[PDB]
Amino acid sequence: MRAKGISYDTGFVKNGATSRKRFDPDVVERELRIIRDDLHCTAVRVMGGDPERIEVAAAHAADLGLEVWFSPYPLELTAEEMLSLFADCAERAERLRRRGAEVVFVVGAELSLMNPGFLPGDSTDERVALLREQLGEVSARVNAFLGKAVQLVRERFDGKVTYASVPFERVDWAPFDIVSMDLYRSADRFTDGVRDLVAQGKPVAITEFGAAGYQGAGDRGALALEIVEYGKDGPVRLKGDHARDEPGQAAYVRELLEAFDAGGVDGAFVFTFALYDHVHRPDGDPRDDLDLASYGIVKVYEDRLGATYPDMPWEPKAAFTTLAEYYRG
Numbered sequence: 001m002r003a004k005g006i007s008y009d010t011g012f013v014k015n016g017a018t019s020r021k022r023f024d025p026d027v028v029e030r031e032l033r034i035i036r037d038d039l040h041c042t043a044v045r046v047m048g049g050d051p052e053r054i055e056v057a058a059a060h061a062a063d064l065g066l067e068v069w070f071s072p073y074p075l076e077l078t079a080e081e082m083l084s085l086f087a088d089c090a091e092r093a094e095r096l097r098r099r100g101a102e103v104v105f106v107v108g109a110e111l112s113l114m115n116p117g118f119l120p121g122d123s124t125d126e127r128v129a130l131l132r133e134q135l136g137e138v139s140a141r142v143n144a145f146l147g148k149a150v151q152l153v154r155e156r157f158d159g160k161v162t163y164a165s166v167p168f169e170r171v172d173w174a175p176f177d178i179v180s181m182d183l184y185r186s187a188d189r190f191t192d193g194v195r196d197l198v199a200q201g202k203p204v205a206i207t208e209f210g211a212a213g214y215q216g217a218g219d220r221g222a223l224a225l226e227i228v229e230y231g232k233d234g235p236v237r238l239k240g241d242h243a244r245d246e247p248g249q250a251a252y253v254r255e256l257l258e259a260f261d262a263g264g265v266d267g268a269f270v271f272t273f274a275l276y277d278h279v280h281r282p283d284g285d286p287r288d289d290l291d292l293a294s295y296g297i298v299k300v301y302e303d304r305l306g307a308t309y310p311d312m313p314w315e316p317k318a319a320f321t322t323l324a325e326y327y328r329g
Contacts, residue, residue, distance in 0.1 A: 001260065003067060003205060003267025004327040005043040006035060006297075009275065010057045013049025014075040017233050020276045023053050027312070029060045034309065035273065036064050039320065040327035043067035045106065045207060045269040049075060051085065055092040062101030069207075069269065070096070071106035071164070076123075077115050079145060082108060086149055090156035097159045105157050106207065107149045109164035110182060112138050118145075128223075139170040150175045164207035173202060178266070182208035184221035185256055194263030203266035210271035211252035213299075213317060214242035214292040218252035228293045234277040238287045246318035253297070254322050270323060274298045274314060297323060 008031075011020035035041045044066050046058045051072065058068045070093040074082045086107060097103040112118035113127050118141045119134070121127035146163060153161055160177035173179050179202045183194070198204050211217050212224035220226070227242065228235045253270055260268045272295050280291035280299035291299045297319040306315035 001265060001268060002203075003043040003069075003269075004041050005045055005067075005069070005205075005267055005269035006039060006041050006323070007045035007047055007071070007208065007269045007272045008032070008035070008057060008061075009272060010046060010048035010053040011050050012047070012073060012075055018050070019234065020048075020053075022276070023056075025056050025060070028057050029064075030309075030311070031273070032057065032061050032064055032066065034312075036066055039324050041066065042327075043069060043267060043269070045069040045071045047071045047073040047109075047272075049073065049085070051088040051092055054089060055096070058093070058096055058101070058103070062096055062099070062103070067102045067104070068093075068096065069104045069106055069205075071109070071207075073109045073114070073164075074111075075114050079117060082111075082115060082145075083149060083152055086153055087156060090153040093159070094157045097157070103157075104160045104162060104178065105153055106180065107146065107153055107161060107163045109208070110166050110169075111145065112142055112169055113166065118142055135168055135170065138168075142169045143172045146171065147175060162205065162207075173200070176202070178203050178205055180205045180207040182206070182222075182271075183256070184209055185252075185259070186219065186221035190256075191259040191262050194259055194265065198264040204264075205267035205269065206256075206260055206265055207269050208271040209253075209256050209268070210295045210297075211249045211319075212293050212295055213244060213246055213249040213319075215245040215248065216242075217245065217293075218248055224295070225293055228278075228290070235290045235293070238290065238293060241286045242292050243286075244289075244292060249297075249317065250319040250322035253319050254326055257323075257326050270297065270319075271295050272297070274300050276300050280315075 011018040162178035274296040275294040278290040278294035279302040298314040300314040
């Protein structure tokens with residue numbers, strides 16, 4: 001694998017709510033340094049809904065020598081709002097690319113699930129729930145929007161362009177430089193599917209894959225956040241009492257990385273470094289240990305610093321060790 005990656009949440013924005021209440025650039029710089037030095041990543045997918053935050057993290061990553069996947073990730077935005085976000089992001093991405101950063105631009109993610117207007121539904125829950133013949137219509141709309149968005153981006157940005165798709169969208173990859181797909185294993189034919197994806201010939205990146213950290217979560221693939229009760233601002237509590245299974249999270253990530261290496265992908269981006277508002281509360285009721293549902297490979301505290309990185313408000317989970325070993329060699 002050429003791009004040994006992880007994604008990095010600078011703050012999704014959903015109805016004005018950020019997923020990352022604190023964005024301290026000194027902390028961001030040190031997290032990205034750990035990602036390079038201790039997770040042995042060569043690339044980072046810098047996600048969010050705030051172009052300035054994405055740009056600050058991407059500039060630190062480039063200054064560290066990391067390949068930057070500049071990755072606006074709109075949530076519940078109209079077409080006009082998405083296009084405006086992409087235009088702003090593409091201008092900043094171009095400024096960075098011109099300074100000599102290696103920058104890939106990602107034109108959104110899973111648009112038919114994350115934003116209205118492709119699939120029926122007023123929320124991602126509604127739209128996912130619809131996965132029980134609309135697929136041609138959904139694919140037509142996604143591809144029509146992507147045709148517009150890619151042209152907008154290429155007017156502003158002269159590097160490689162991709163899109164973090166899901167399989168059912170049936171993206172036309174003709175306008176893109178890289179084929180990117182979000183692939184959760186949930187099991188038998190998996191590596192065969194990866195090889196088919198690689199076979200069309202353009203470099204392939206797996207832009208999103210991972211598991212949460214409770215017992216059984218790897219089975220539930222991309223649906224592991226279904227145990228979370230969400231409120232006005234973010235996660236509030238878990239619906240039931242779940243045991244922690246950090247080894248199972250680590251083993252899921254490693255097995256998928258093995259399947260992607262075997263299948264020949266160009267890049268893979270573990271989802272994810274941290275989900276900062278899914279706080280770890282190890283010494284209380286498990287229903288309040290929001291970190292159990294986190295796809296992050298570190299566990300973030302609300303009120304303490306960690307032991308391994310004593311200036312950091314988080315601690316590695318087992319999956320952090322596993323990724324580091326996998327990417328080291």
